[PDB]
Every structure is written in structure tokens, then in C-alpha cells.
Amino acid sequence: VPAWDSDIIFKCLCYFHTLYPGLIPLETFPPATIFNFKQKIISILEDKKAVLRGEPIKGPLPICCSKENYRRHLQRTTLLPVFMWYHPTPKTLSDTMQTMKQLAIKGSVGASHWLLVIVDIQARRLVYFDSLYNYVMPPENMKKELQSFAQQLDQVYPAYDSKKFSVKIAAKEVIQRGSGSSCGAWCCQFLHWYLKDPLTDALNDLPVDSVERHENLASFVQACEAAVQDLPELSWPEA
Ligand SMILES: *C(=N)c1ncc(C(=O)NCc2ccccc2)cn1
Numbered sequence: 001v002p003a004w005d006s007d008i009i010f011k012c013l014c015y016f017h018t019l020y021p022g023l024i025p026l027e028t029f030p031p032a033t034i035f036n037f038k039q040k041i042i043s044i045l046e047d048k049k050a051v052l053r054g055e056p057i058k059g060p061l062p063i064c065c066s067k068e069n070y071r072r073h074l075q076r077t078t079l080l081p082v083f084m085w086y087h088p089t090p091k092t093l094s095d096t097m098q099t100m101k102q103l104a105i106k107g108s109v110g111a112s113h114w115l116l117v118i119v120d121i122q123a124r125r126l127v128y129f130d131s132l133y134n135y136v137m138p139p140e141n142m143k144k145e146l147q148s149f150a151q152q153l154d155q156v157y158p159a160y161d162s163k164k165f166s167v168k169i170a171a172k173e174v175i176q177r178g179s180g181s182s183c184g185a186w187c188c189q190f191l192h193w194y195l196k197d198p199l200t201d202a203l204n205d206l207p208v209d210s211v212e213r214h215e216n217l218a219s220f221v222q223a224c225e226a227a228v229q230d231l232p233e234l235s236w237p238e239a
Contacts, residue, residue: 004184022078065236072239080119129170
């Protein structure tokens with residue numbers, strides 16, 4: 001399991017869209033951070049609302065998608081896959097990005113991490129997946145912050161019947177125990193299980209052995225690399 005950078009994660013999301021068209025393949029460059037992921041999601045869901053009323057979108061067009069295609073995505077999507085790039089040190093979005101840029105040139109992970117927040121529009125579910133279990137803060141604190149965020153989302157994107165957005169913390173233990181490179185791949189793997197089954201408890205079923213579980217993850221990665229080989233580069237699928 002090598003390191004999955006943003007480009008490979010994007011591709012894999014593109015591919016994921018062609019399998020599960022309700023997933024919008026949100027760009028990972030520049031990615032969401034722990035400082036702006038809320039605002040980014042709110043802005044996406046507001047643009048979705050505009051699209052449903054035939055109105056103009058306000059928020060920014062993706063770099064690799066036409067206006068027209070982005071409207072159709074927004075109309076069809078039932079699932080926002082938000083990839084969050086974390087490092088413990090930077091204390092602002094701009095610093096986070098600078099650190100991200102810096103760590104690319106040094107060509108190491110360092111202490112950097114990817115997190116996944118799934119905004120499941122259909123189930124009305126916020127799903128927080130950290131393969132390190134508590135790299136950003138404890139799961140219980142993160143749950144509480146997300147229950148707050150989930151209430152803003154009830155106001156921003158109301159349901160027909162006022163069903164409230166619920167929050168699940170995906171990882172109950174450290175998932176990527178004996179690997180410091182696998183966090184992108186884990187995030188895509190967890191995503192894929194979730195698409196296959198949103199009622200998944202795939203994480204609970206994992207083999208206890210850290211080697212076994214990363215062998216399986218490696219197969220996963222090979223299957224995806226094979227599956228996206230011929231797909232266009234830097235190019236959203238057409239919704
Ligand atoms: C998870 N194990 C993991 N997450 C993030 C990185 C990382 O960001 N490395 C530096 C980098 C490479 C390419 C583009 C931007 C940043 C590594 N590992």
C-alpha cells in the first residue's frame with residue numbers, strides 16, 4: 001500500500017462515480033481541511049438547492065469540470081465524499097495548505113493524514129472516517145462537533161419530513177495499525193464499502209492481524225489502479 005495522493009484519490013472518485021452515480025467526484029486539489037470542510041459542504045448543498053430551483057450556482061466551479069456537467073452532478077448527487085487533509089501543526093487553512101505544498105516537495109507523509117467525511121444526502125448521515133481513530137481529536141469530541149454541524153445542515157438542506165441529520169463515527173479502533181502510508185487507500189476502501197452497503201459494518205469485520213488487513217487493502221489498491229488505467233486524466237465523468 002503506497003501513499004495515495006490527491007490525484008489518485010480524485011481518479012478513484014471519478015471511477016466511483018461511474019459505478020455509483022449518486023456520488024459527486026469532488027476535487028481533492030486543493031482539498032478540504034478541518035478549518036473549511038463545513039463551509040465547503042454548506043456551499044455545495046446550497047448550490048444543489050439552487051440547481052433544484054433552476055437558479056445560478058454561486059460557489060466555485062471545479063477546475064476539471066464544465067459548468068453544464070457540474071449542474072447535472074449537483075442535481076443527481078446523493079453523496080458528498082469530502083476528503084480532508086490534516087496535519088497537527090498548522091493552525092489556519094492557509095498554513096495547512098502551505099504545509100501540504102511543503103510536504104509534497106519533501107516527498108514524505110510526515111505527520112500528515114487524510115480523513116473522509118461522507119455527507120450522505122439520502123440517509124441524512126454524516127460519516128467521519130479516521131483510519132488512525134483519533135488523530136485530530138477524540139472520536140467523542142468530533143461526534144459532538146458534527147452533531148452541531150448536522151443541525152446547521154437541517155436548516156441549510158431541510159428534509160421533506162424534518163428528519164435530522166445523524167452522525168456516525170466510523171472507526172472504533174486504530175484501523176491502519178502497522179502502516180504509515182495507507183491512509184488515502186483506507187479512505188477510498190471505506191468509501192467503497194459504504195457505497196456497496198451504507199449499512200456496512202465492514203470495519204468491525206476486519207481481520208485482527210495488521211498484516212492480513214493490509215494485504216487485503218493492497219488488493220483493493222491493485223484492483224482500483226487496474227480499473228482507472230484507461231479513464232481520462234483531470235476530467236470529471238459526465239453525469
Ligand atoms: C496517509 N498515510 C497520508 N496522508 C497524506 C500524505 C501526504 O500528504 N504526503 C505529502 C503530499 C504528497 C503529495 C501531494 C501533497 C502532499 C501522506 N500519507
